[PDB]
Amino acid sequence: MDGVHDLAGVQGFGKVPHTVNADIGPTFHAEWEHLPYSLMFAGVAELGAFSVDEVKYVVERMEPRHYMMTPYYERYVIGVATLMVEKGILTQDELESLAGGPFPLSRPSESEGRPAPVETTTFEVGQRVRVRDEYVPGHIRMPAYCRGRVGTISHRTTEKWPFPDAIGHGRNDAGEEPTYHVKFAAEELFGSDTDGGSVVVDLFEGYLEPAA
Amino acid sequence: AQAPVSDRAWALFRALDGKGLVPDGYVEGWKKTFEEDFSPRRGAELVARAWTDPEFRQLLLTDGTAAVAQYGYLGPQGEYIVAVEDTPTLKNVIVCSLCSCTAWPILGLPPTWYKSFEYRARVVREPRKVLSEMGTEIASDIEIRVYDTTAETRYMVLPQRPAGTEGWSQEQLQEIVTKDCLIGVAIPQVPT
Ligand SMILES: [Cl-]
Ligand SMILES: [Cl-]
Ligand SMILES: [Cl-]
Ligand SMILES: [Cl-]
Ligand SMILES: [Fe+3]
Ligand SMILES: [Mg+2]
Ligand SMILES: [Mg+2]
């Protein structure tokens, strides 16, 4: 999904709000902040109501202005709440009744997702690959800065995982794929407009193809 | 228009808890895990071991998962580990441009700044400037390599061991390997 969450390479942001080794305070800065993750885990591990991938996607589905003005942990309160409503476990009415006011949720999905591709390639360390020049309106674990770009395999994972584009919509056809650490030169991704060396992106097999 | 976030968060809890969907002690357990167990002190232990034990260093860099599992530090959002080695010509730095992905059990939960739009947008494109702004000058003769945590691999940086620490104990070395060193934005510092 080409959402506002796909931030890498966006220009116009200011200073990162940290100097090295500065005190970051306690893990949680408010008494509610442990709830989103704890309740995500109740959903995923205790109830089996949704996957972690579905949490990533439902946050991506926040209305864009809403995403941009919402602090991190609050996004996950909104996301987990959304998924519990979509899955029929909770209603928006009961959340607003208990909250004492408005509890706007993430927007509905505009895509049904896609299956894990049946046609893929097992790549080896050192091989040159291109990131498939595809547009996926639902969930995908490919940041747009690498779409269509060529890099080299640094690592093939020794485990396999469900294809996010499927399991992030709760589909039954996510399969399993290894991922690849793909090293791109900074200039391949941003031309002359970068100060870096290389960027390594961890990409699912199904996002890759051999380089020309 | 929105109700206070505290009210929304506790409404979500109460809604689920009142349906019997949240086990007794469940969120409080996770809070304890998040606050007390998941910690960059674990990553610092791993780094100090690698610095003092060439055999373990080799293991950590070839099969990070196995190395971490020896200490019992595998966990949620930290099941498949890769450690990435700084060298005299290479500085590694970790981000999750899409959200916040972090090796929780060994780095701790990510700090506010790592989840910031500023870090997520900028470090992939201008890592040298971002590190500089943060207080870390990377010599012009060093490649920066940004790892974007886009799948299930969870990373930790193995920083270079600084001079002036020869012969230190593992406990001593642990002390100078900070969270920011593990993420890759800081270089371990030796007092005088
Ligand atoms: Cl609170
Ligand atoms: Cl292919
Ligand atoms: Cl912070
Ligand atoms: Cl620290
Ligand atoms: Fe993330
Ligand atoms: Mg753009
Ligand atoms: Mg030495």
XYZ file of C-alpha atoms and ligand atoms in Angstrom:
411
model
C 0.000 0.000 0.000
C 1.509 3.337 -1.104
C 0.471 4.969 2.119
C 1.863 7.826 4.108
C 3.475 5.253 6.416
C 6.032 4.514 3.620
C 8.282 7.289 4.884
C 11.809 6.283 3.842
C 13.222 8.936 1.574
C 10.534 11.552 2.254
C 12.122 15.025 2.428
C 11.222 17.970 4.638
C 11.444 16.489 8.104
C 13.499 18.191 10.759
C 15.955 16.898 13.362
C 15.523 13.491 14.912
C 14.469 14.218 18.535
C 17.486 12.662 20.254
C 21.156 13.146 20.934
C 23.152 9.994 21.449
C 22.917 8.359 24.804
C 20.540 10.931 26.154
C 18.167 9.637 28.791
C 14.994 8.381 27.028
C 13.054 8.069 30.316
C 11.002 5.016 31.321
C 9.899 2.376 28.848
C 6.319 3.698 29.125
C 5.674 7.357 29.577
C 1.986 6.928 30.434
C 0.070 4.307 32.399
C -1.829 3.033 29.340
C 1.136 2.641 26.971
C 1.648 -1.116 27.589
C -1.883 -1.859 26.500
C -1.576 -1.840 22.714
C 1.180 -4.406 22.605
C -0.266 -6.498 25.429
C -3.660 -6.603 23.733
C -2.072 -7.281 20.344
C -0.569 -10.352 21.952
C -3.913 -11.326 23.483
C -5.390 -11.094 19.953
C -2.608 -12.975 18.200
C -1.522 -15.611 20.749
C -4.530 -16.109 23.071
C -7.488 -15.551 20.742
C -6.010 -16.337 17.356
C -8.133 -13.463 16.010
C -5.488 -11.979 13.781
C -1.820 -12.077 12.800
C 0.965 -9.527 13.601
C 0.870 -8.718 9.874
C -2.772 -7.702 10.181
C -1.739 -5.248 12.951
C 0.892 -3.675 10.712
C -1.670 -3.346 7.925
C -4.512 -1.940 10.027
C -2.136 0.845 11.199
C -1.236 1.509 7.534
C -5.029 1.835 7.009
C -5.410 4.797 9.358
C -6.802 7.755 7.417
C -3.569 9.544 6.264
C -4.016 12.813 8.194
C -4.999 10.773 11.245
C -1.795 8.685 10.909
C 0.362 11.764 10.634
C -0.981 13.435 13.779
C -1.167 10.393 16.039
C 1.624 9.351 18.407
C 3.083 5.873 17.996
C 1.460 3.900 20.814
C -1.916 5.509 20.140
C -1.777 4.227 16.514
C -1.664 0.684 17.911
C -4.586 1.319 20.290
C -6.530 2.465 17.224
C -5.261 -0.490 15.116
C -5.953 -3.244 17.636
C -9.410 -1.719 18.353
C -10.126 -1.620 14.616
C -9.198 -5.312 14.185
C -11.385 -6.363 17.112
C -14.320 -4.540 15.536
C -13.637 -5.911 12.031
C -13.346 -9.438 13.357
C -16.723 -9.104 15.166
C -15.285 -9.387 18.673
C -16.110 -5.862 19.716
C -18.377 -3.061 18.458
C -17.469 0.534 17.877
C -20.487 1.489 20.030
C -19.175 -0.325 23.077
C -15.678 1.169 22.618
C -17.136 4.732 22.422
C -19.508 4.024 25.320
C -16.606 2.876 27.531
C -14.345 5.667 26.252
C -16.915 8.357 26.852
C -16.488 9.895 23.432
C -15.305 9.418 19.886
C -13.072 6.467 18.931
C -12.511 6.739 15.205
C -10.953 3.642 13.692
C -8.737 2.752 10.721
C -10.451 2.800 7.303
C -11.622 -0.339 5.699
C -9.293 -2.196 3.468
C -9.464 -1.338 -0.250
C -7.850 -4.607 -1.237
C -8.521 -8.282 -0.533
C -4.762 -8.949 -0.516
C -2.966 -11.389 -2.797
C -1.649 -14.876 -2.443
C 1.909 -15.945 -2.071
C 3.162 -16.185 -5.702
C 3.429 -19.765 -6.977
C 6.364 -18.740 -9.251
C 9.507 -17.632 -7.423
C 13.283 -18.233 -7.456
C 15.661 -19.424 -4.799
C 18.534 -16.919 -4.827
C 22.086 -17.369 -3.566
C 24.461 -15.023 -1.803
C 26.187 -12.763 -4.303
C 23.418 -12.952 -6.968
C 21.965 -9.785 -8.401
C 18.244 -9.364 -8.087
C 15.666 -6.734 -9.041
C 12.737 -5.845 -6.857
C 9.608 -6.711 -8.926
C 8.082 -3.560 -10.487
C 4.609 -4.238 -9.061
C 1.981 -2.132 -7.338
C 0.110 -3.752 -4.447
C -2.767 -1.802 -2.944
C -2.971 -3.936 0.143
C -0.281 -4.883 2.571
C 3.281 -5.366 1.353
C 6.636 -5.389 3.179
C 8.426 -3.605 0.351
C 9.148 0.134 0.837
C 8.671 1.999 -2.390
C 12.257 3.320 -2.491
C 13.390 -0.167 -3.628
C 10.651 -0.953 -6.168
C 12.270 -1.792 -9.483
C 15.779 -1.373 -8.107
C 18.697 -3.766 -8.405
C 20.861 -5.043 -5.597
C 22.857 -8.054 -4.411
C 21.959 -10.892 -2.057
C 23.812 -10.714 1.238
C 21.809 -13.435 3.105
C 19.082 -15.964 2.487
C 17.176 -16.738 5.671
C 17.293 -20.280 7.056
C 13.589 -19.988 8.129
C 10.477 -19.208 6.167
C 7.439 -17.115 6.971
C 3.959 -16.407 5.573
C 3.803 -13.863 2.676
C 2.761 -10.607 4.272
C 0.523 -9.597 1.347
C -1.695 -12.554 2.179
C -1.514 -13.022 5.937
C -1.796 -9.237 6.513
C -5.361 -9.582 5.157
C -6.091 -12.781 7.143
C -5.994 -14.896 3.982
C -5.536 -18.651 3.931
C -2.980 -18.619 1.058
C 0.143 -16.997 2.542
C 2.312 -20.044 2.124
C 5.843 -19.700 3.364
C 8.883 -17.999 1.876
C 12.371 -17.182 3.029
C 13.525 -13.563 2.901
C 16.672 -12.087 1.469
C 18.916 -9.313 2.705
C 19.308 -7.286 -0.460
C 22.123 -4.703 -0.562
C 21.538 -1.640 -2.646
C 23.984 1.074 -3.376
C 22.720 4.403 -1.994
C 22.939 5.869 -5.537
C 20.747 3.079 -6.959
C 17.976 4.243 -4.621
C 18.426 8.033 -4.456
C 20.788 9.016 -7.247
C 23.114 11.820 -6.342
C 20.788 12.889 -3.460
C 22.036 10.833 -0.563
C 25.007 10.877 1.784
C 25.045 7.105 2.496
C 26.884 4.014 1.291
C 24.450 1.143 1.062
C 20.996 0.175 2.267
C 20.045 -3.421 3.041
C 16.331 -4.281 2.708
C 14.980 -7.652 4.020
C 12.742 -8.740 1.149
C 10.433 -11.730 0.748
C 11.308 -14.065 -2.139
C 8.026 -13.151 -3.874
C 9.154 -9.521 -4.185
C 12.252 -10.446 -6.173
C 13.255 -11.603 -9.679
C 16.585 -12.203 -11.307
C 18.350 -8.989 -12.484
C 17.916 -8.572 -16.290
C -12.653 14.527 17.313
C -11.384 11.954 19.842
C -11.761 11.047 23.474
C -8.607 11.215 25.520
C -6.203 8.521 24.480
C -5.965 7.139 28.056
C -9.795 6.715 27.952
C -9.632 4.969 24.579
C -6.849 2.632 25.621
C -8.584 1.591 28.851
C -11.870 1.283 26.948
C -10.209 -1.265 24.656
C -8.913 -3.133 27.685
C -12.231 -3.025 29.529
C -14.181 -4.152 26.441
C -12.041 -7.206 25.963
C -11.542 -7.954 29.678
C -15.262 -7.769 30.300
C -15.816 -10.506 27.681
C -13.306 -12.795 29.365
C -10.817 -12.492 26.523
C -7.914 -11.266 28.629
C -6.386 -13.785 31.114
C -5.919 -12.712 34.754
C -2.659 -10.830 35.188
C -2.096 -10.809 31.375
C -1.323 -7.157 30.581
C 0.479 -6.703 33.857
C 2.710 -9.680 32.896
C 3.538 -8.196 29.583
C 4.249 -4.831 31.201
C 6.757 -6.514 33.481
C 8.402 -8.299 30.524
C 8.603 -5.090 28.541
C 10.027 -3.077 31.454
C 12.302 -5.531 33.194
C 13.283 -8.408 30.857
C 13.562 -6.917 27.354
C 16.603 -4.762 27.765
C 19.682 -3.445 25.915
C 21.724 -4.832 28.801
C 21.267 -8.213 27.100
C 22.594 -6.969 23.781
C 25.514 -5.342 25.691
C 26.309 -8.714 27.254
C 26.374 -10.309 23.831
C 28.668 -7.628 22.446
C 31.074 -7.835 25.457
C 31.196 -11.622 25.068
C 31.977 -11.309 21.316
C 34.686 -8.769 22.037
C 36.394 -11.090 24.512
C 35.720 -14.525 22.942
C 36.669 -14.925 19.274
C 34.801 -18.207 19.023
C 31.554 -16.589 20.230
C 32.106 -13.588 17.925
C 32.298 -15.957 15.017
C 29.064 -17.706 16.130
C 27.248 -14.401 16.665
C 28.150 -13.178 13.153
C 27.345 -16.473 11.361
C 24.316 -17.736 13.308
C 23.056 -14.882 15.453
C 19.944 -16.838 16.469
C 22.008 -19.644 17.885
C 24.328 -17.242 19.725
C 21.399 -15.418 21.323
C 19.662 -18.648 22.206
C 22.739 -19.730 24.239
C 22.002 -16.831 26.641
C 18.260 -17.581 26.529
C 17.472 -14.160 24.982
C 15.269 -15.206 22.001
C 11.794 -13.791 22.362
C 8.927 -11.971 20.750
C 10.107 -9.725 17.893
C 13.500 -11.346 18.315
C 13.319 -14.925 17.034
C 15.621 -14.667 13.989
C 18.691 -12.579 14.821
C 21.432 -11.185 12.622
C 24.302 -9.300 14.076
C 26.047 -6.892 11.793
C 29.743 -6.115 12.226
C 31.222 -2.588 12.177
C 34.783 -2.521 10.755
C 37.372 0.219 10.211
C 35.641 0.986 6.901
C 31.985 0.228 7.692
C 29.391 1.626 10.094
C 26.033 -0.151 10.332
C 22.785 1.483 11.496
C 19.317 -0.061 11.975
C 15.844 1.393 11.293
C 12.316 0.277 10.595
C 11.212 2.789 7.980
C 7.713 1.280 7.795
C 6.927 1.226 11.555
C 9.287 0.366 14.459
C 10.626 -3.123 14.016
C 13.364 -3.770 16.621
C 14.994 -6.814 18.251
C 12.944 -6.235 21.432
C 14.428 -8.939 23.763
C 18.025 -7.789 23.330
C 17.655 -4.071 22.527
C 14.569 -3.264 24.580
C 11.432 -1.748 23.077
C 12.307 1.012 20.660
C 12.686 4.553 21.962
C 10.343 7.404 20.799
C 13.025 8.846 18.600
C 13.624 5.581 16.641
C 9.872 5.452 15.876
C 9.806 9.117 14.860
C 8.866 10.093 11.373
C 12.123 12.079 11.238
C 14.325 8.989 11.815
C 12.146 6.708 9.672
C 12.205 9.153 6.699
C 15.757 10.432 6.914
C 18.223 7.804 8.079
C 17.777 5.624 4.951
C 18.648 8.571 2.702
C 21.041 10.736 4.713
C 22.439 8.609 7.454
C 25.662 10.558 7.790
C 23.845 13.805 8.449
C 21.362 12.203 10.798
C 24.151 10.612 12.866
C 26.031 13.884 12.868
C 23.035 15.769 14.156
C 22.617 13.157 16.849
C 26.233 13.623 18.006
C 28.068 10.889 16.068
C 30.610 11.995 13.449
C 31.423 9.174 11.119
C 34.854 9.790 9.558
C 34.458 10.533 5.754
C 36.656 7.476 5.053
C 33.853 5.063 6.458
C 30.882 3.452 4.388
C 27.501 3.719 6.141
C 25.167 0.778 5.670
C 21.534 1.172 6.811
C 19.584 -2.003 7.530
C 15.787 -1.481 7.054
C 13.945 -3.965 9.220
C 11.223 -4.854 6.701
C 10.612 -8.568 7.461
C 11.351 -11.001 10.332
C 15.128 -10.638 10.650
C 15.859 -8.569 13.779
C 19.235 -6.918 13.895
C 21.872 -5.783 16.385
C 25.040 -3.904 15.644
C 28.344 -5.325 16.827
C 30.292 -2.071 17.222
C 34.037 -1.832 16.999
C 35.809 -2.223 20.342
C 37.336 1.078 21.301
C 40.923 1.561 22.186
C 41.602 2.026 25.873
C 39.501 -0.962 26.861
C 42.151 -3.653 26.564
C 41.876 -6.229 29.321
C 38.588 -4.920 30.670
C 36.215 -7.430 32.177
C 32.953 -8.380 30.410
C 31.094 -6.311 33.085
C 33.244 -3.290 32.358
C 32.762 -3.577 28.594
C 29.004 -4.119 29.007
C 28.738 -0.737 30.647
C 29.884 1.212 27.561
C 27.688 -0.670 25.060
C 24.504 1.419 25.191
C 21.142 0.990 23.486
C 22.251 3.532 20.898
C 25.368 1.547 20.174
C 23.227 -1.567 19.467
C 20.935 0.392 17.138
C 24.077 1.800 15.477
C 23.672 5.532 15.958
C 26.408 5.779 18.694
C 29.965 4.485 18.955
C 31.007 3.058 22.373
C 32.854 5.767 24.375
C 35.703 5.199 26.820
C 35.947 7.609 29.812
C 39.491 9.166 30.515
Cl -3.597 6.016 31.902
Cl 11.378 -14.951 -9.943
Cl 13.242 9.368 22.850
Cl 21.600 1.972 27.411
Fe 8.496 -1.692 12.590
Mg 7.090 10.644 -2.604
Mg 41.867 -5.958 21.166
